[PDB]
Design a protein around this ligand. Sequence first.
Ligand SMILES: [Ca+2]
Ligand SMILES: [Ca+2]
Ligand SMILES: [Ca+2]
Ligand SMILES: [Ca+2]
Ligand SMILES: [Fe+3]
Ligand SMILES: [Fe+3]
Ligand SMILES: [Fe+3]
Ligand SMILES: [Fe+3]
Lengths: 166, 388, 388, 510, 510
Amino acid sequence: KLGIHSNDTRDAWVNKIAQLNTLEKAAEMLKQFRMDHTTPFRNSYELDNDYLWIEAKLEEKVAVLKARAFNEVDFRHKTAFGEDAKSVLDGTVAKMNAAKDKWEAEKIHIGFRQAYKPPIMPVNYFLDGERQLGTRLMELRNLNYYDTPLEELRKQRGVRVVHLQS
Amino acid sequence: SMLGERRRGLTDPEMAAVILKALPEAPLDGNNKMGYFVTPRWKRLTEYEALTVYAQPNADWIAGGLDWGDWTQKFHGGRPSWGNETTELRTVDWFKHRDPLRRWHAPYVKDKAEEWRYTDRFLQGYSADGQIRAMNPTWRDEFINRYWGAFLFNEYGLFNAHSQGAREALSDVTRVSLAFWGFDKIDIAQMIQLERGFLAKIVPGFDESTAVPKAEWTNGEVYKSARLAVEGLWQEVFDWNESAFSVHAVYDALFGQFVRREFFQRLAPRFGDNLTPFFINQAQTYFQIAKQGVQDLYYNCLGDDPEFSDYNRTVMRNWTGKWLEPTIAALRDFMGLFAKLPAGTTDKEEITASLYRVVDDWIEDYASRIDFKADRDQIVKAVLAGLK
Amino acid sequence: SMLGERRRGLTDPEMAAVILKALPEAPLDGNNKMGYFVTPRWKRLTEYEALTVYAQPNADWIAGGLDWGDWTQKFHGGRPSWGNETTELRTVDWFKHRDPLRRWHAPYVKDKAEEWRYTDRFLQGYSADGQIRAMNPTWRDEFINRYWGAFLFNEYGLFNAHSQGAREALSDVTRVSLAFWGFDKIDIAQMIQLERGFLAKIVPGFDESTAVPKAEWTNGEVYKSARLAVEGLWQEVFDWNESAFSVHAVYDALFGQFVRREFFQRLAPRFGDNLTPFFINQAQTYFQIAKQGVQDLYYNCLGDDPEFSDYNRTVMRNWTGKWLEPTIAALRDFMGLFAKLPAGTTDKEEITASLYRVVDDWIEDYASRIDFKADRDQIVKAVLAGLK
Amino acid sequence: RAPTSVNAQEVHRWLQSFNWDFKNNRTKYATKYKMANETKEQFKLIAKEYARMEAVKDERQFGSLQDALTRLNAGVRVHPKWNETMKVVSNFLEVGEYNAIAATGMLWDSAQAAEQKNGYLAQVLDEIRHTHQCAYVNYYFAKNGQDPAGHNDARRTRTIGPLWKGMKRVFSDGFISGDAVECSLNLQLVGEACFTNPLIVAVTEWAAANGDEITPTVFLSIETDELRHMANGYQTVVSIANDPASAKYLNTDLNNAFWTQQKYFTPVLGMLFEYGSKFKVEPWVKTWDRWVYEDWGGIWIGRLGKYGVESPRSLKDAKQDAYWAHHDLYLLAYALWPTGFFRLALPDQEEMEWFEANYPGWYDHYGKIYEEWRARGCEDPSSGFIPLMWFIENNHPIYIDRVSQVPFCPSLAKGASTLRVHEYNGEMHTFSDQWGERMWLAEPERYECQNIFEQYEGRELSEVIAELHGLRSDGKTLIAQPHVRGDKLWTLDDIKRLNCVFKNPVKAFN
Amino acid sequence: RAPTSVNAQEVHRWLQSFNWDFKNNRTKYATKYKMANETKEQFKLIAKEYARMEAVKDERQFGSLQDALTRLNAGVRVHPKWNETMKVVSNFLEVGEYNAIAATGMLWDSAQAAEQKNGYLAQVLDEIRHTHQCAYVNYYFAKNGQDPAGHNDARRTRTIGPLWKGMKRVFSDGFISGDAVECSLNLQLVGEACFTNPLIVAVTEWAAANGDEITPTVFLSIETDELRHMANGYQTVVSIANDPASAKYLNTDLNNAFWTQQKYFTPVLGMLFEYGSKFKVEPWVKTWDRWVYEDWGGIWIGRLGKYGVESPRSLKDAKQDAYWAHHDLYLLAYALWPTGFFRLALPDQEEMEWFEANYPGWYDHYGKIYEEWRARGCEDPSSGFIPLMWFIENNHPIYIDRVSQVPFCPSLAKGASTLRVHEYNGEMHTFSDQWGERMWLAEPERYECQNIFEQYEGRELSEVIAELHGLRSDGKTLIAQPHVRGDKLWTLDDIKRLNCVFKNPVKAFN
Ligand SMILES: [Ca+2]
Ligand SMILES: [Ca+2]
Ligand SMILES: [Ca+2]
Ligand SMILES: [Ca+2]
Ligand SMILES: [Fe+3]
Ligand SMILES: [Fe+3]
Ligand SMILES: [Fe+3]
Ligand SMILES: [Fe+3]
């Protein structure tokens, strides 16, 4: 079974997700999944064709579990890991505003997403974070955007140049 | 020339013959129904559904999507164009919602257009019939110009609360309903100003400037907590569903309904004002129209979701508790307006009865739908403390 | 089949080629304006005039006609299809009249259609918003069901008064206006019943049957003289202009405007009734619409006729006196209604104020136009004699 | 607090109770019948719903006209002959729509039952819409067509010709002058059910065949309203059937109404269809028999038998006179072409073959005559020849029936050739059939319409035309023409030089 | 006491004052810019008047469609090729209209001045209108056309093919993902002003030429709303011009947006126009130059010079790469015909002559290729041949640009032949140009879109088509076809006979 919308990989993860019955275990698995399968900094590209869908299914479980475990105040203001959302948001923004360059900035923004994307951090704080972190990242990235030659930009990004044609 | 220079394949003999010759003997498929694969909400697929459902290019990783793969271009940082992360609510399918009134763009502007022309005829007939003669001067210059006027900012704020939703909604049916709910709010805000502009034309000395109503809204006491709530709902909420739900199923259902229906519409007639009720009537019609959509999305689709019913109700109960307090504060401050009315206009018993009507309607139409345990007498008691 | 069996000359290659081949190089006349010979009332000729003026095939012996000769077939006895003999008024041209609103069939039904759908939406919002909860039971079951209902027979009678005029009108522009004046009257009668039917649906024991309101009209005391005046204006007048003039410029301008605006409209709000006023709004907008047409025909055209100005004014001043008496009597009887109102609802100072507004508006819009010097104080006094 | 409203039917349920009893509550018009006060109507409409259902139609119609059709130049890509035909079809129908307003106003007054008055009222408003719709057709072709003259002023230029007189008899006076019931039969039972309804649909057919998509857009919309008018005519009979007078008068008023209507439409409609087009849809002989004998005379009338309604006693006579009627009339219409407000064309080779195929003997009579006139130069201004001259030269007087106003030429006609001339109190009268003759004998004062020969007697042709504005914009070229080509148009001077002076043909019997 | 009222402008005069100050009154979206708080809008509209003006347009539009156009069978009498082109043109435009709704919702949130928010709001409402209009075109052709398949389910069948991915980049994600200002440039200053506005007008011309009067009716109406959006775009620049950030970032965001839009439309539009039609209106080469260089790059951009706006630095590159771009792409679209939701046709004899005439050298390259594929039997189901096989046999790999999603075959193309392959953190990436390469290198996390080869790797073709519902109602015949004739349509089994299995072309690299 190797379909686009339905396949063995997806089935296997649905089974794996069905066994996460406590918030801490489920939230931890979601964060681990994001480190392992999302963004260009992911640990591997093995789940490239299904990770987006699988991540959503894992999110669903963490969400329902969090709503059942947290009281109303905590559901609004705490992360799934019990951290104070505002503190995390403010702390991350602080680091972002201190970032020395666009390279440090991209790591901060991307890492923040992998770690706190809802249902880990409440949506309100998370999108407020997107608003602030994204602004700085762009301000740093878009300054003198074309000054660096591609020959050198390839080195800065750290890609392995496999083939070139002209 | 009489015939023009451009030749059309439908009428040009040479071109049409070329076209006709290339045609098949019959259609290459007998299924002439666009959107035939959409699950109909009613007996048969509606034009509303065919033209709307699945227009949004969501992939399967956003519940209900038919596409596949990641977006082609995302935000700096990685945020997806549309994603599950923009709202706390979950569902098996974001395309399940249906506006009970089945409004796509054509039917929507058609009705509002009828209302615009009807309004123009009304004002002309009202002015030509000299009905302004029967309006109490104090009610007109104090309560309509200042207090009803100030309310336009409330509706304007609620309109603006929809901006993020227009951008983040996770489906076409929800985006369209959401856009129409917001559009009707700015329309009401503009109809309040329109009334003031009308009065400026038929009443010597009546100033249509918004300076007075705006100073009341921004610095007065009657609307202080109302403004604080609006500012929060609009700019402190980043979850498009928390915004639409809290605005329509909490704040506007309680504060909005009370101000429009239980204060201005209930009292205007007692001062020879048939003008304001004309517009409030539109606002109430719009309110009831939005209610149907709000109820379908939050109660029928999300609150009753086969997989996330329990979860979504827990979240909406959370939101109701969160926004009920600021809403009660808004009503409490508004109670201060009654002390400014001419003695004998109304009394504590009428005010209390009208509060209970709004609260009971709210419990029946909204709170009960998610099992929120509202205590009607405790809510009214908290509000009545604002009576001076 | 997919293409069908019928060949159309606009799209069929063979047939279109033949058509194209027969066409002239350019239009055979550059005057592409239908009705170019009609004298415009405004800057440029309007669609309203082009599509209406001269549609009626009158010969020159009927002031303004462009045709010649007698009618082809007349009534047994010799009576002409249309003739100067069907009305006392005379003019230099029966096609002079112009509806200020320039209403031909299309715009007319478009406006009424919008009003119908606006009305449907209003009722739906009213019922969903539970606004009926604020209406006084007595006013509802007594003054709305019986007395407002009874008034539907008044409007209905005024509608029927237009039947002969629809047949005898001496020009297209006058027939179209007359038809619309009458059509709006039966509409109002129907709206009165519609409201009673609406109440029947939302108020458990409310009976929509016309029995009660009909008995009041046929055997009641409040509308006795009103009914007698209506029975006369309709079946005792054989002059289409006398009927139209006397109905709109005398009876309905006084009695009608009082009962509608000065009684039900003015008092409904005090009883928590925002429903009745919604419909009366339409009746008033209609009255104002028909008024502009009535004024243009009897004053601008006939009253100020370059040749029969004095003559017509004499005839209209005559009709005014002839029907002012039955109209006064109609008001007097209606006065008895105020005694049935709950104590404290209204006093004599208000009644007198409303009566003067009607009479004054009448003198300002009609009486003064034809030099019918009327005594406002004498009128208000005669009517006032009907109170308790 | 469920959303609730009220519809037309729910209000209409109590409409019958709106009327109340009282002394003078009776019709103001002379009538031999008594319409039952308990008569009901088929459709349960109220003013507001009526407006909405019509407003929806207007939307589609005007939308198509102003947008797609205008973008397709639909007003231009129509056969010249059809552009001309629509000047007559639309304007002449317009007067029928217009007088129908006054007619139904008269019936509304006659009816005593509130519902019956309401039925007539709906038609009053419908006929107003149709008046404006027909007006819009001429308005549109004037604005966007190949020849605005006529389309732009038919309301006054139609008064010049003889065909207009007969149209007024069936579409104007026949609709409003007489017993209300007689008028109802002329308008609804006969006019609308037997002719207008079918005619309007047929016109959309011929229009489409000739490139005209403007007319179908408007006429098909008009057609959607006719069901209510059919109902009115039918209910007119139902409302008087239980009255004694009915058995004594109905069939007589009906027969007179049938003869009246058919007298004009039989020759005129066939003429407009077959001679006012290039592409043909169906032979008029076949159409007529179906409409009159099958559809109306059979099915429609048949259903009213239970109400004492019988087939017009003049039906067979009508069929006898019908066959060559339209062919005989076009000869006269073309001979008098200078009196019209439209351009006429002679049959081309394909058409003559079509006429002969469908009407054996057509060529030996009409065909040879048209070719004779053409070779003589009837289409050329410098020829100095107008077919009217041929009629004088060959002693073929053209008369106008005193009752129907229909032109007839007994000495040349292939169809009916009967002629009755009478003198009464110093005035001569010419009749073309036994039914019309009776009408005049029994009702002399109902028919005093002066004919064109009487009004124009002693007048020179170009003078009548000039006076009645039969000219195009340039003030010199005639609106009417003997051909439909763009060149060599006749001018007022071309006519003046002929020195044609009208004479009253009846005076020859003096 | 005279009839008086109030209009839109009178109320709008006070709209700017509707917004008020408070600590948190600020946009919720990340942005490098600051839109001036006193920014004004060009049109003084309010909700009520907006609805009226649009309602009037709908009336004319739908009236034409439901009435006259349907009566004329306008949905059928269109060239087969154009019926297919509209499946793509209308549904692809639909997504642009749709995302523009969200885009302007985002811009409405960004603007702080009430008037500027209001301008964006009008567009929000217009794009909903346009979404439903494009939907209606497909809806109409499905209901009344020669081939409903595709028109009736594009919302899901579009997901099978590679062209859709690139459409989402410029018409979906490009419109809503990034700095609100960057999004505004992609949507309004570049997208609408340079491409969509001109594109919409052009389509009505090509449609009319190919017998399609349905699209002109809708698109011409859509076009009437664009004035407001152009103004929004212009005002975006004005609103941020006085901010220091503008001088630092504006031209960079503008250049990126220009390259983004152009990269897709340059090859795709020219392809749809020339290869998706029978009758040609104008050679894409001249059309493109006028639109991009003259109209947009010259006039439009020139007016913004006063605000610091400069001509995109990548303009020259775009032109050089533009000449053969659409021709290069059709070769790929046809070879991958089984992955579409529309039927394609090989250029016919008359067309090849037109191509060669307008693009010297076309025949020696593309012509011969098509002739070879034809000989191989690419149109016949029993051939067991699909052009894709030809690419394999001649070692011509097809890659997918990681950024624009535009397919390219560098070893065969007559235009751009550049190819850059990088490996990064365990993933391979292929780029077709230096602008898209910089975008990925600088913003890796913005471009992770998986391509069809990555998703379909190791999958047999017929299974992908079946899985994604690429079949007609008979459940066997493919929606897509290698020819537009009514007979010999390929079925799923014919594609299965073939045994085509996808492979990721980048895996060849070590
Ligand atoms: Ca306070
Ligand atoms: Ca009390
Ligand atoms: Ca309690
Ligand atoms: Ca390797
Ligand atoms: Fe009619
Ligand atoms: Fe009729
Ligand atoms: Fe658009
Ligand atoms: Fe746009």
